[PDB]
Amino acid sequence: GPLGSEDDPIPDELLCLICKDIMTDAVVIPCCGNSYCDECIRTALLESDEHTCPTCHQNDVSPDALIANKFLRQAVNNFKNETGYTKRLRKQ
Amino acid sequence: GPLGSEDDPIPDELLCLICKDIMTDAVVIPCCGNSYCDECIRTALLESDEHTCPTCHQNDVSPDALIANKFLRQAVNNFKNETGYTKRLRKQ
Ligand SMILES: [Zn+2]
Ligand SMILES: [Zn+2]
Ligand SMILES: [Zn+2]
Ligand SMILES: [Zn+2]
Fold first, then answer.
1. Zinc finger (RING-type) residue ranges (chains A, B)?
2. Is A20 exposed, middle or buried (0-12, 13-18, 19+ CB in 10 A)?
């Protein structure tokens, strides 16, 4: 049936595994190929001295080796506009 | 108007720039981040001794450094099933 009208789950083709949610300005990891939030993937490598990838569990990656997944960022932007994905910010 | 009725173009978020068409099992280039057909991107580096990227015109890439854009391949698979994009395959 149809999805996206009032409900729809974010696909893994544009959803960060680290926070299990969509990301903006997503990057790619040259250790495996998965894409996540720039900050999310950075945190994984920063907190892991072994540079343990948060998906393939690699031990030779780097937050400086993060490439720009143009396609990812594009899809996310379109997806957000189709289903109208967004959230309510606060005055924190 | 809407898209998907009887005509729909392939977006740059899952469309290969090299052949200007969708691809399957797309890979990513760690030089810039763009994704293209494994065969297409391979050909670009294979024919260019300078390893001139077919998008950013880099000079230090490689067909071996091609990573697996999990997300790309997933998007392509879904997109193909949405519009019904496909072609004549052969059992060679
Ligand atoms: Zn990895
Ligand atoms: Zn994230
Ligand atoms: Zn490039
Ligand atoms: Zn191609």
1. 16-57
2. exposed
CB A35 within 8 A of CB A27: yes
Tokens 């854009």 sit at which residue?
B69
* E runs forming strands in chain B: 15-16, 21-22, 27-28, 35-36, 67-68
Q: Tell if the CB–CB gap between B72 and A13 is shorter than 8 Å.
A: yes
Whole-number Å distance, alpha carbon B18 to ligand 2 midpoint, is 30
Number of domains making up chain A: 1
Question: Residue A21 belongs to what domain range?
Answer: 1-92
The residues in B 42-71 lying below 8 A from A, measured between CB atoms, are: 65, 67-71
The experimental method, as deposited, was NMR
